[PDB]
From a paper:
P. gingivalis displays two forms of fimbriae on its surface, FimA and Mfa1, both of which are crucial for attachment to other bacteria in the oral biofilm and to the host cells. In the work presented herein we have determined the crystal structures of the shaft protein Mfa1, in both mature and precursor forms, the anchor protein Mfa2 and a truncated precursor form of the tip protein, Mfa3. The resulting mature protein thereby has an empty position in the first β-sheet that a β-strand donated from another fimbrial protein presumably fills in order to polymerize the individual proteins into a polymeric fimbria.
The mMfa1 structure revealed that its C-terminus was partly located in the position where the N-terminal extension is expected to be embedded, based on previous structural studies of related proteins. Further, the C-domain consists of a mixture of β-strands, β-hairpins, coils and a few short helices. mMfa1 has the same overall structure as pMfa1Δ9 but, as a consequence of the missing β1-strand, a void is formed in sheet 1 which is partly filled by the final C-terminal residues. In mMfa1, the long C-terminus fills the same position as β1 does in the precursor form, albeit running in the opposite direction. The C-terminus does not reach through the whole sheet, leaving the short helix, described above, and part of the neighbouring strand disordered. The metal ion is coordinated by the side chain oxygens of Asp507 (bidentate), Asp509 (monodentate), and Asn512 and the main chain carbonyl oxygens of Asp207, Asn512, and Gln514. Instead, the end of the C-terminus reaches to its own empty β1-position and partially fills it.
Residue numbers in the entry: 64 to 214, 230 to 563
The structure:
């Protein structure tokens, strides 16, 4: 990436002076205009941190003569720190600075079609892209200054993580691995085009500043860390913790078209002066942290498909007409099977074969099977999951995927290898007894009793991979900001 990993704007500075030793009065200087009170950042080439040096003194008022610790929030642009910390006693302040803020309500965590293409997301409320120029992101200190007496330095880290996605190519050729209609193993089966992405299941709340856990399997805890969904509790409780509004980003109401944000190539990241829309894709997407107890297997890892942040990749799968086992045949009712038309719905049976309709799927005269179910791919839409931080890599072993603030998770797609899923079960359904779900852009299009493509109670890894990807975790160019006082 390089220059696309973010350039920061500091708009506001909030300083909290907290007397030590027991009950007492906090002195706060909130939402100070950065330019008025601070010099422009200078980078420490050793640490890659930026240092903010004050120009103007802040009035210490009642804290004069006291031993205090200093806490800092930069860019409290949603007012969340101010509101949480209001009228908090000095004795309660350190604990309060680690308590929970809510970026989206449980109701706001679910969007609908009317919220596209630019839905408010939880993380976007405290991480703003200012045109293509720079970005304003909330930051808080993991720990306050050392104790000092008024007559030091406070390091802060960004409150969001960033997801970035790239692809080797904008099209992929798919080969059959077994006989599919007239297509032999090793021959071309389909082409994938029009690749897009969104991110979901980051959290909707967060600890104001990073909160250490109690066991080594989860260094930093998040409000949702203890939530381990079953197939049923996912639907009733997932929105208590996670944000899904982002599923509607760059949504398109034409089902012939693939919804979501473009996925740039590596070369796109080297282009100078870029369109607005591509610039937005290149700078990625923000999400709030999401961690669970890590383990070495399904039983010991608390990371589940229904509680882990994911990138959803969407694309157009165009199969060769010759792949259809029903091609050229005659139905049991003595009518002819129509050839597949590119871009139209297609149906993939439990047997892996391709059919132009459900009528074909269950008619043995055309290579169907009575009683057999199929996945309906709506106008050829296919879906794939990528986890943000597979720990470790790479196929059937990435049991864990923590997302921690102030990190960038770059997912590079090297290839899409096979047919994906036809809908996204990793979205809470307010009435799970029916397939309708206005909160999901990719609801279940299948007939009753069709096997689900995946389940929220499942572990992360795939037995055999749908995509080849490499994930890189990196810091912002400026790792953290140091505020001098
Ligand atoms: Ca439903």
């Amino acid at each position: 990436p390089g220059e696309w990993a973010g350039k920061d704007k500091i708009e506001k500075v909030s300083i909290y002076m907290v007397p030590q030793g027991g009950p007492g009065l906090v002195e706060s200087a909130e939402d100070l205009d950065f330019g008025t009170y601070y010099e422009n950042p200078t980078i420490d080439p050793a640490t890659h941190n930026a240092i903010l040096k004050p120009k103007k003194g802040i009035k210490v008022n009642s804290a004069v003569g006291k031993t205090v610790k200093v806490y800092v929030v930069l860019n409290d642009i949603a007012g969340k720190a101010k509101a949480l910390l209001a009228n908090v006693n000095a004795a309660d302040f350190d604990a309060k600075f680690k308590e929970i803020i809510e970026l989206s309500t449980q109701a706001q965590a679910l969007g609908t079609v009317a919220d596209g293409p630019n839905p408010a997301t939880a993380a976007g409320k405290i991480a703003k892209k200012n045109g293509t120029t720079d970005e304003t992101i909330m930051m808080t200190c993991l720990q306050p200054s050392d104790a000092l007496t008024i007559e030091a330095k406070v390091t802060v880290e960004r409150s969001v993580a960033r997801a970035m996605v790239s692809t080797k190519a904008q099209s992929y050729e798919i080969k059959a691995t077994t006989q599919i209609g007239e297509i032999a193993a090793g021959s071309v089966l389909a082409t994938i085009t029009d690749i897009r992405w969104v991110v979901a299941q980051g959290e909707r709340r967060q600890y104001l500043s990073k909160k250490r856990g109690t066991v080594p399997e989860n260094t930093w805890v998040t409000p949702g860390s203890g939530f381990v969904p079953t197939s049923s509790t996912f639907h009733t409780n997932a929105t208590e913790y996670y944000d899904y509004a982002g599923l509607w980003e760059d949504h398109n109401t034409n089902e012939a078209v693939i919804s979501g944000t473009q996925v740039p190539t590596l070369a796109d990241y080297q282009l100078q002066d870029v369109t607005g829309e591509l610039a937005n894709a290149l700078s990625g997407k923000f999400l709030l942290p999401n961690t669970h107890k890590s383990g070495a297997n399904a039983a010991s890892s608390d990371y589940k498909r229904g509680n882990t942040a994911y990138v959803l990749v969407r694309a157009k799968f165009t199969p060769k007409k010759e792949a259809f086992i029903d091609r050229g045949k005659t139905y049991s009712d003595n009518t002819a099977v129509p050839e597949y038309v590119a871009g139209e719905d297609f149906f993939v049976g439990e047997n892996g074969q391709f059919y132009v309709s459900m009528k074909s799927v269950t008619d043995p005269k055309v290579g169907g099977v009575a009683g057999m179910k199929a996945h309906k791919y709506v106008k050829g839409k296919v879906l794939y999951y990528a986890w943000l931080n597979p720990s470790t890599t790479s196929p059937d072993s990435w049991w864990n995927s923590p997302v921690v603030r102030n990190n960038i998770y770059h997912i590079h797609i090297k290839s899409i290898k096979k047919l994906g899923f036809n809908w996204n079960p990793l979205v809470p359904d307010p009435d799970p007894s029916n397939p309708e779900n206005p909160n999901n852009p990719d609801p279940n299009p299948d007939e009753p009793g069709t096997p689900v493509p995946t389940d929220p109670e499942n572990p992360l890894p795939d037995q055999d991979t749908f995509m080849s990807v490499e994930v890189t975790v990196l810091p912002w160019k400026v790792h953290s900001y140091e505020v001098d006082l």
